[PDB]
From a paper:
pmcThe enzyme ribonucleotide reductase (RNR) synthesizes the deoxyribonucleotides needed for DNA synthesis from their corresponding ribonucleotide precursors. Class I RNRs are composed of two proteins, a large α-subunit (R1) and a smaller β-subunit (R2) that exist as homodimers, that combine to form an active heterotetramer. [name] is a hyperthermophilic bacterium with an unusual RNR encoding a 346-residue intein in the DNA sequence encoding its R2 subunit. We present the first structures of the [name] R1 and R2 (AaR1 and AaR2, respectively) proteins as well as the biophysical and biochemical characterization of active and inactive [name] RNR.
We expressed, purified, and determined the X-ray crystal structures of two AaR2 proteins: one in which the DNA sequence of the expressed protein lacked the intein (AaR2) and a second in which the nascent protein still included the intein sequence (AaR2_genomic). Following purification, SDS–PAGE analysis of AaR2 and AaR2_genomic proteins showed that they were of the same size, indicating that for the AaR2_genomic construct, the intein had successfully spliced itself out of the nascent protein sequence to generate mature AaR2. We crystallized the mature AaR2 and AaR2_genomic proteins and determined the X-ray crystal structures to resolutions of 1.73 and 2.10 Å, respectively. Autocatalytic splicing of the intein in AaR2_genomic generates a peptide bond between Leu229 and Cys230, which thereby brings Glu228 and His231 into position to serve as ligands for the dinuclear metal site. In contrast, the di-iron site of the AaR2_genomic structure showed electron density consistent with the presence of two iron atoms, termed Fe1 and Fe2. The two irons are coordinated by four carboxylates (Asp97, Glu127, Glu194, and Glu228) and two histidines (His130 and His231). A higher occupancy is observed for Fe1 compared to that of Fe2. Fe1 was modeled with an occupancy of 0.8 and is positioned by residues Glu127, Glu194, Glu228, and His231, in addition to an ordered water molecule, whereas Fe2 was modeled with an occupancy of 0.25 and is coordinated by Asp97, Glu127, His130, and Glu228. The distance between the two iron atoms is 3.8 Å. The phenolic oxygen of the presumed radical harboring tyrosine (Tyr134) is positioned 3.1 Å from Asp97 and is 4.7 Å from the nearest iron atom.
Author numbering:
A (entry chain A), B (entry chain A): 7 to 327
Write the structure that this text describes.
Amino acid sequence: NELVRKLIFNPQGDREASKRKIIKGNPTNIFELNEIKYSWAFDLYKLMGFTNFWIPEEIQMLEDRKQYETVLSDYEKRAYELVLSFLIALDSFQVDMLKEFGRMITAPEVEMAITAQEFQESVHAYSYQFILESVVDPVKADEIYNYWREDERLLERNKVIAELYNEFIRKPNEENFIKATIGNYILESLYFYSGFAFFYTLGRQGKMRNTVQQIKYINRDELCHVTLFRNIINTLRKENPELFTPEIEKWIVEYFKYAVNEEIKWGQYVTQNQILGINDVLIERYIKYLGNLRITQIGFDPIYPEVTENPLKWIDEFRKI
Amino acid sequence: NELVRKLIFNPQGDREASKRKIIKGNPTNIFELNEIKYSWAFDLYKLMGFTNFWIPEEIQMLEDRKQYETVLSDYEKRAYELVLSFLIALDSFQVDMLKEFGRMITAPEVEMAITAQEFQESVHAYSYQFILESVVDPVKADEIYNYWREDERLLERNKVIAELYNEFIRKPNEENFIKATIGNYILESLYFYSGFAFFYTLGRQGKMRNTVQQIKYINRDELCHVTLFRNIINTLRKENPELFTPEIEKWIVEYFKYAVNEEIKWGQYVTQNQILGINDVLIERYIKYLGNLRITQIGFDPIYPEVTENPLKWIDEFRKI
Ligand SMILES: [Fe+2]
Ligand SMILES: [Fe+2]
Ligand SMILES: [Fe+2]
Ligand SMILES: [Fe+2]
């Protein structure tokens, strides 16, 4: 089931916005934005593109360079490096992969939303370069960008995230599309969140609160990104039920469980109970709470039915802007 | 010469920013933005992404709906429709094609700049939908989006712009890459500029000055877009001289001349000497002046050596924000 990439202009395209599909539609590829079939796509474009606009270099980085230099434990510095190294990798993969999704989507408003998302991932990449230029020395910043070259746990996370995307790239069929889409949702649902919790920990004890400002903006973006793919997956289920074979529906629950498992083993490798305010048990229930939250939001039963409340419920108010 | 699309993560990638190439480089595809080989790419990202940020819906559209309703000649309304219809088509093609360029570029800072450009093209698409929702009735706005369905001159412009891009899409080789790149530069250099001159005409007689506000923002964006591809083409010439065969170098001067010719035949079909302040002769020298300006900026002799001054030199000060 080989998804063609639409031609640049289709004079035999449907005039009728009502006939749009997320995939395999018959558009003109003119952005006929006087009629919107997916109001969520256009609302999310306006939210990411205009409402939540932000400039990383307008966040003051006056203090963090000192707190790093003298006030951070050797464990806090290790975490800082690992977390920032991995988030740099994630946002790099996303800038690139979202171009693959956008060029396959046949609904203009959804392509618009994906373009805005791609742009926000580029802003994140700008934010990390600004965080490091401000906070650390030049060889150290190079080392953090390159830390996968020294840390096999980090290298293996990266190769694994790339694996799911490269199957679709190399073999661009409907199956490999749904799995990439699910992989995107998992990556935005889960893989930021050991990282975010750790920064909001450092920050609730008044450490690296400049870095934490940057992180709050990134995390606002990532909730919009999660919402966008939630809608794409749930609309894809309605519009293309053939694609959610029982094999696929099973795999979705396998990967979501694996993914929850790994984010926890990273959360714990990063921290190692050496970070005041977070331990290996709190981590486990955060990621399992997030897993159920996100797999149910896309039409599945909880995967960790024991967990029902959010261990870190304080983050919801801290992370607000 | 078949340009592979880089894999999502390359652990065998060069660590050394100095070794980046615009195409056919060997990157990790981690955005290692602590070292920038192409300062112009990163400066242009910051300029498009942060400095020149703008929100179309924050431009007041109080007057234009009335001026359209009563004050615009039947010829002024025809132009308005044709110009806006064609710019909607251009910006649609660009949002989509820039995803093709970004996924082929191996220098992260240039991919960043292309992402920002893609995002600005989406903002333009938002601007046109806002211009029409404000200025005209719902069936008329649909008609303007769809005007290629009624006007064979407009349909043929569209199919022609798509042709150059689809060769690269269908046959993604080095030759078809350079021609697409040149086509992008021509489209941003020329194909906006009958349209821009016409709006700044309407606007120097105090007609549709709200539309003209929107247009000034779009035209600031398009000058950054022209600069970006100027640099890409001139860097591609240094880095890949094999690709600028004499066949190619000849074709570049053919298409640039054709393209100047067509933009004039559109400029004249749109207006028809029925627009106070612009005639078929002024058009001819504007587009020929722009042609030399842009083909020389990418290492060629003037193509209209008779023309040396800019007929509409007043636009440079009018269009400023
Ligand atoms: Fe991000
Ligand atoms: Fe994201
Ligand atoms: Fe545009
Ligand atoms: Fe443009």
